[PDB]
Amino acid sequence: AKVTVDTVCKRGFLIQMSGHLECKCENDLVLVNEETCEEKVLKCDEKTVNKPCGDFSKCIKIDGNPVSYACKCNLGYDMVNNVCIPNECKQVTCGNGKCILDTSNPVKTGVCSCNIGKVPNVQDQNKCSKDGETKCSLKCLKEQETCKAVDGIYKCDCKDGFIISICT
Template sequence: MNTYYSVFLFIYAFLGLSYYNAAITPNTKCKNGFLAQMSNHLECRCNENFVHVSNDTCEKKVECSVDTVDKACGEFSKCVMHENEGKATYTCDCINAYAVKGDICVPETCQNIECGFGKCIINEDAVNDPPICSCNIGYVVNTEDGNKCTTEGDTKCSLVCGEEHQICKKINDFYRCDCDEGFKLNVEEEKCVSHSIYSMLNLSVIFVILLLFSNII
């Protein structure tokens, strides 16, 4: 019985590790975020006020305190309690396998790597390979400059925007699927609706609120 239990724990841990290190693909569903493309990789980016807890999952960012221990307080970091001589302090520490670089947490193997106009990434399908630089859109790797992102160049969008009225757009330094011209994202329904319909929905909500308020008065 103990042998079966040990095997079960091993499989469970392996699957958990595989899930955590799973490479981001065009089919990845980013929790509380969206799929973004840089020059050499895809990644999940978090919605506003959310931070990464794993490659494909973002959680609401909290202020580190006694009430938020183990909660996400920054990118790939969580609130940790430290006790010294009976006094507790709370700090926002990097999660396992991440280390501080500047004011953010990055993979430990990327801590001393500079990429120029890009970021250091790990190949999750071959974790024993050395990390590489993935460039902001508009830059490509310069093989004569230590494979840093210091050369201007184009990268085509490879994202598959399957939702209706969505197209691939360059937003700042990355590509993402966004609403086409004349459409706006309805956050609650997670779909693109026309500006006119969106405006009508907002006006309807305002009208109902005013009507309820007038009845209360």
């Protein structure tokens, strides 16, 4: 469903931007859903149908003679810049941010969620160009971690006086 501060990212971790939270996968894993990561198959064949080949994409059989196998985005997504994004985000550019879904209305619609420090700018097609502060909501319950701004996103990381599996 919708990722919150209480979502348990299976084989991933929580990140926060200006208008949403989402799970970020570990290693070279890919998203099978909003809160689950798995290994990515490298070649789609009859042995890898339905297995994940990317974020919100899995191998599927394509009809025809001869039949083929390819990495296709899940229902509700399409391939844009080699990544599966929601249909509502197809022609969307957010700037220093991401296009996410607003699902609060019967008609789902795409909005922008920005890197920490920016908010959508009504004077710039709602792109992530306006300065704005975002308070971090992450619960970094590990006794040695706190919320830090890493590469423009909020993320539980080692505190100001520790480094790297426990933060020590």
